Amino acid sequence: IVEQCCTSICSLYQLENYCN
Amino acid sequence: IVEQCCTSICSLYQLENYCN
Amino acid sequence: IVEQCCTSICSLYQLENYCN
Amino acid sequence: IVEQCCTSICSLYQLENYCN
Amino acid sequence: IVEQCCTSICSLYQLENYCN
Amino acid sequence: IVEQCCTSICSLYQLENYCN
Amino acid sequence: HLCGSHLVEALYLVCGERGFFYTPK
Amino acid sequence: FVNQHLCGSHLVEALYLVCGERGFFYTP
Amino acid sequence: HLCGSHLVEALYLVCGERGFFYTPK
Amino acid sequence: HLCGSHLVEALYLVCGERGFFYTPK
Amino acid sequence: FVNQHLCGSHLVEALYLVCGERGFFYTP
Amino acid sequence: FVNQHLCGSHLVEALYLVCGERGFFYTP
Ligand SMILES: NCCc1c[nH]c2ccc(O)cc12
Ligand SMILES: NCCc1c[nH]c2ccc(O)cc12
Ligand SMILES: NCCc1c[nH]c2ccc(O)cc12
Ligand SMILES: NC(=[NH2+])NCCC[C@H](N)C(=O)O
Ligand SMILES: NC(=[NH2+])NCCC[C@H](N)C(=O)O
Ligand SMILES: NC(=[NH2+])NCCC[C@H](N)C(=O)O
Ligand SMILES: [Cl-]
Ligand SMILES: [Cl-]
Ligand SMILES: [Zn+2]
Ligand SMILES: [Zn+2]
């Protein structure tokens, strides 16, 4: 998540890949 | 907004409404 | 601080008081 | 606001220009 | 987690437990 | 604290040196 | 239950790239 | 601009307190 | 009393470098 | 109504450049 | 990476809201 | 230093939890 999401702005789909 | 999301419960999908 | 701003209501102007 | 306030530290007067 | 730290009171020391 | 803790990641011991 | 600054935080998660109005009253 | 996006998160929190019952408008 | 996003903030102060699971239910 | 970490956040909006003391008790 | 550590703080807040009763997993 | 100012926001939140009933002092 850090790699993907602190680099470019992530989207609410990138984020939802870390829900359980 | 406050009724929709604080008084009643809200969805992140429902809050897309308020995006300008 | 807690009485002034949590128990009673507070102002951002009133909190300037606590700036060191 | 981003331009003005994520560049230099803004002040509570810069910020208050975005109240309704 | 919620019982331990929201219902009952918690310690930052006790939350070390949940670190993966 | 800024010098010590906004530079490197600080640890909960660096931080606890600013408790009263 | 999203009240006070948490409602604003939630508004920002969804709209922060587009922009939004917050008008409590 | 990630660091502006993070920064925006802080600004809306600040406008929330600054503005009161008036509310505010946020726009990149 | 640590509830909602404040419990998550507290989890992060302690574990944010290691990582953690948050499973409310 | 400014309690817990929200009171600290409010203290910081106003004083974060000057500095402050937070002493709840 | 300090700015990633700060960034992580924002991500977990976002996952908290995004995920609901499911919860989430955070890992650098 | 904007990114330090943002960083300061996170530190006081962390000191709030870290310190308990003792409270803390914040100073750039
Ligand atoms: N679509 C932007 C959602 C979002 C909110 N906060 C964030 C922090 C980091 C990131 O990559 C993304 C976000
Ligand atoms: N006087 C500093 C007020 C303040 C609080 N948070 C902020 C974030 C960005 C900024 O430009 C300014 C601020
Ligand atoms: N051990 C990481 C604790 C921590 C939480 N938030 C922080 C912000 C800045 C810092 O140096 C450290 C921290
Ligand atoms: N990042 C957020 N918006 N978190 C929501 C936390 C819920 C909080 N107990 C409230 O009064 O709304
Ligand atoms: N950064 C934090 N976790 N702060 C804890 C604030 C306590 C808050 N009143 C709650 O509902 O839990
Ligand atoms: N950024 C802030 N200080 N927000 C104030 C939110 C009010 C919150 N319901 C409280 O318990 O105080
Ligand atoms: Cl709350
Ligand atoms: Cl940040
Ligand atoms: Zn809260
Ligand atoms: Zn931040």
Numbering used by the authors:
A (entry chain C), B (entry chain A), C (entry chain A), D (entry chain C), E (entry chain A), F (entry chain C): 2 to 21
G (entry chain B), I (entry chain B), J (entry chain B): 5 to 29
H (entry chain D), K (entry chain D), L (entry chain D): 1 to 28
Passage from the reporting paper:
A similar set of crystallization conditions yielded crystals of insulin in a ternary complex with serotonin and arginine (referred to here as InsSerArgT3R3). Despite their similarity, two of these forms (f1, f2) (referred to as InsSerArgf1-T3R3 and InsSerArgf2-T3R3) are reported here due to a dynamic (i.e. with high level of disorder) nature of Arg/insulin binding, hence the need for more independent structural evidence about the nature of these interactions. Despite the presence of arginine, the serotonin modes of binding in sites I are practically the same as in the Ins-Ser complex. Some serotonins in site III are bound in a fashion observed in InsSerT3R3; however, some of these ligands are flipped in both InsSerArgT3R3 crystal forms, i.e. the -OH and aminoethyl groups switch their positions. Arginine is accommodated there in channels within the T3 trimer, parallel to the hexamer 3-fold axis and opposite to R3 trimer sites I filled by serotonin, which leads to filling the voids around Zn2+ and His-B10. The flexibility of arginine is concentrated mostly around its -CαNH2COO− moieties, which form weak alternative HB to main chain groups of CysB7 and HisB5, also exhibiting some flipping around the Cα atom. In contrast, the guanidinium groups of the arginines are firmly engaged in extensive networks of HBs, which link them with side chains of GluB13, the side- and main-chain of HisB10, and the side chain of SerB9. This simultaneous binding of the two very different ligands to the T3R3 insulin hexamer polarizes this oligomer even further into two structurally distinct trimers, Arg3T3 and Ser6R3.
Insulin is one of the key human protein hormones that is responsible for the maintenance of metabolic homeostasis, with an influence on cell proliferation and regulation of aging. Insulin is a 51-amino acid protein consisting of two disulfide-linked chains (A1-A21, B1-B30) and exerts its functions through binding as a monomer to the (αβ)2 heterodimer tyrosine-kinase-type insulin receptor (IR)5 (10, 11). Insulin is produced from a single chain pro-insulin and stored in pancreatic β-cells in storage granules (termed large dense core vesicles (LDCVs)) from which it is released into the bloodstream in response to elevated blood glucose levels. The in vitro data showed that insulin hexamers can be grouped into three structurally distinct states/families: T6, T3Rf3, and R6 (15, 16), which differ by the conformation of the B1-B6 N termini of the hormone B-chain.
